[PDB]
Ligand SMILES: Cc1ccncc1NC(=O)CN1C(=O)COc2ccc(Cl)cc21
């Protein structure tokens with residue numbers, strides 16, 4: 088028992104981290120097979136970042152301008168290309184530590200682990216959710232660009248995120264591994280509206296189920312609700328409307344605990360309307376939304 | 392910017408995890424050089440656990456009864472010995488993935504990362520603190536025994552914890568890597584009092600400094616306090632008394648922000664007495680104590 092914000096073991100991803108330098112800019116790159124992926128803004132100076140013409144900036148660069156170093160050793164760059172907001176540097180050596188991997192575009196509300204890196208060296212690992220507005224609330228500093236987000240299914244690493252920037256509001260934005268930004272963001276130093284965010288309802292309900300499994304049950308009540316009634320409350324409190332697909336994904340947790348999904352919705356309704364009255368749930372004094380129903384099942388079953 | 396409960400990258404520790412089986416019990420072991428360390432209760436059956444005579448139980452075991460498997464391959468056991476509550480199994484092969492390492496006994500209030508494992512396979516990584524009462528609030532299930540806690544200083548892994556048991560209260564207890572339990576616990580299935588716990592004051596103050604660095608500053612006030620006055624409040628709210636050694640450890644954070652330690656103590660005093668009035672600090676609705684002043688400095692500087 089016990090429930091923690093757990094990240095996937097980062098070993099398979101640590102083996103892929105490299106440092107990429109172009110001119111005076113150094114950031115992180117991901118070396119998979121004979122290709123190194125990194126944010127295309129590695130080719131900019133600070134002066135270029137207000138409105139960079141990436142196509143023109145990249146034309147001034149040759150393979151030998153991209154310095155790629157895998158810890159101690161230097162990689163030989165034999166090709167370079169830009170795909171959306173990422174650069175792909177072809178190297179003459181396939182990474183011997185390349186794990187089985189996939190590139191995936193995650194849905195808002197899904198979670199993943201981030202291996203924060205600086206100068207190609209891993210500094211720490213944390214779990215987070217892709218917000219409904221396609222931002223992530225990470226922990227990143229200057230030099231963290233190129234750090235990646237991922238999930239692991241037994242021996243396969245599905246890379247879903249590459250870090251690009253911090254918005255003026257302190258939140259984070261990035262791309263999938265094909266260089267497409269999540270959300271409306273562009274890789275330019277401009278103020279950028281991140282949409283209205285909402286709380287990931289299906290994940291809060293999953294976390295209330297994790298709470299019951301682990302013995303925190305004070306919030307359970309004698310009530311039930313309907314999807315319509317619950318959604319009027321979700322509306323008022325800026326929670327994502329609950330759908331039958333979310334109820335379906337919560338089936339395994341409802342089966343394990345014997346608590347019907349709509350009954351858990353009535354506990355969440357009372358918590359939204361009344362607050363937590365100075366009490367905690369799984370060590371938190373707020374409703375947590377960074378655990379998916381899959382995360383709860385994985386953590387509560389002991390999947391490796 | 393941003394502040395997360397970040398764990399150390401687990402790669403160096405994943406390389407050391409093995410499965411240890413003795414009879415019908417399987418748990419995790421730590422393979423460093425030519426020795427595998429694991430909880431001594433691997434030699435018990437469920438019947439033995441009410442009051443095991445470990446010396447007698449171990450005399451019934453020979454080297455060949457300890458099945459050690461490093462993922463796919465089997466290790467040959469050439470010696471076994473019990474040191475406090477750990478077994479040390481000498482193997483004929485030194486672990487080729489052994490990192491630079493140390494065994495350390497951590498102080499209560501210090502933090503570390505845990506790589507939760509099942510059947511010798513890593514399942515996830517999370518950061519936690521050793522509570523003042525020498526328990527840890529982890530996330531562990533049956534089979535997690537032998538999972539380790541550690542910290543990393545550049546290339547050196549300091550192992551500080553090995554998981555042994557869950558107390559009837561759902562909290563966790565374990566040993567240093569010499570097999571000495573943290574706290575008054577014994578490796579026996581008996582109800583065991585974990586002392587009165589307290590909140591780690593120096594870590595809450597470190598986290599309020601992390602909040603200011605990251606822009607959360609609503610809790611700052613026009614007041615100051617003294618160590619004596621602050622300690623009367625710490626007493627009432629079950630917080631550890633603050634000492635000059637804690638103020639000294641907070642020096643770098645006070646220097647970075649320009650907020651004197653006693654002025655931050657006055658913000659913490661007002662938060663203890665008034666609560667957070669429905670507001671949050673770094674995404675938390677309670678006062679967080681799982682970040683040491685070293686953790687805050689490391690996270691806010693980008694140490695790899
Ligand atoms: C400093 C920091 C902290 C956390 N995560 C990332 C960063 N770094 C950046 O954001 C880099 N960067 C700027 O600093 C400003 O101009 C930009 C415009 C576009 C893009 Cl892609 C990057 C930038």
Ligand SMILES: Cc1ccncc1NC(=O)CN1C(=O)COc2ccc(Cl)cc21
Pocket residue numbers: 088432440531532533534535536555556557558577578579580581
């Ligand atoms: C189940 C679980 C969940 C989380 N962490 C650990 C465990 N496992 C245990 O605690 C094993 N175990 C018992 O189950 C009961 O008897 C004991 C007495 C002493 C010692 Cl050392 C171990 C045990």
